[PDB]
Amino acid sequence: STIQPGTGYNNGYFYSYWNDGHGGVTYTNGPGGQFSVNWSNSGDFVGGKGWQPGTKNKVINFSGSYNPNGNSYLSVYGWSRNPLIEYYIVENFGTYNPSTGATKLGEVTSDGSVYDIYRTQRVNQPSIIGTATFYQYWSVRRNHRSSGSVNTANHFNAWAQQGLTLGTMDYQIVAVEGYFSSGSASITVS
């Protein structure tokens, strides 16, 4: 069903839904690995379904509809702890490339596309452990898509070759993010 921000497990899939307290977003958990997001003149939000904990070799499948009108992205989104790392494997995005401002570390080929890889240091920013400082890694698919399979190990290995140390895995979801925009999405994860 439709929920307010929070985390939990639904039909055997972990979910996380976060927003900045601005209105304009509706997040709904559906059957199995399904979730939907509908938004209209939102603030900042990100939510979706997957695993808690994730793993360093998961092959993540997703399908469905993704129709942003403005700034948004569809990604595999997760964290590690000790060290604290935030990461995104971006499969599609709207009007803004969310890796803008991050430092390019190279490229990796996975699951039918080249990806550009990046990182940036986030300083005194919200995180799964509260206000914190941590590196944020990106892998941005050149050939955008809204269904597919992601071999996460290819991305983790590419980042590791340029200095990433992944600690203990925390959650790992397929997420829809929006940033002062409108859109819809209906995604099924497995």
Q: Tell whether residue 13 is among the known ligand binding residues.
A: no
How far is the C-alpha of 169 from the C-alpha of 171, rounded, in Å? 7
Is 107 a known active-site residue?
A: no
3-state secondary structure of 47: strand
Q: Tell whether residue 77 is among the known ligand binding residues.
A: yes
Looking at 177, 179, 185, 189, which residue is catalytic?
Answer: 177
Q: Tell whether residue 171 is among the known ligand binding residues.
A: yes
Quote the strand ranges of the chain, DSSP E.
2-3, 6-10, 13-19, 25-29, 34-39, 44-51, 59-69, 72-81, 85-93, 103-110, 113-125, 132-141, 148-151, 168-179, 182-189
In the Cβ-directed half-sphere of 123, how many Cα atoms lie within 13 Å? 2
Backbone angle region of 6, left / alpha / beta, with phi > 0 → left and psi within -120 to 50 → alpha: left
Looking at 86, 91, 116, 170, which residue is catalytic?
Answer: 86
Residue pair 186/64 in contact (Cβ under 8 Å)? The answer is: yes
Residue ranges for the binding site for substrate?
Answer: 73, 77, 88, 122, 126, 136, 171
Residue ranges for the binding site?
Answer: 73, 77, 88, 122, 126, 136, 171
Residues marked as catalytic: 86, 177
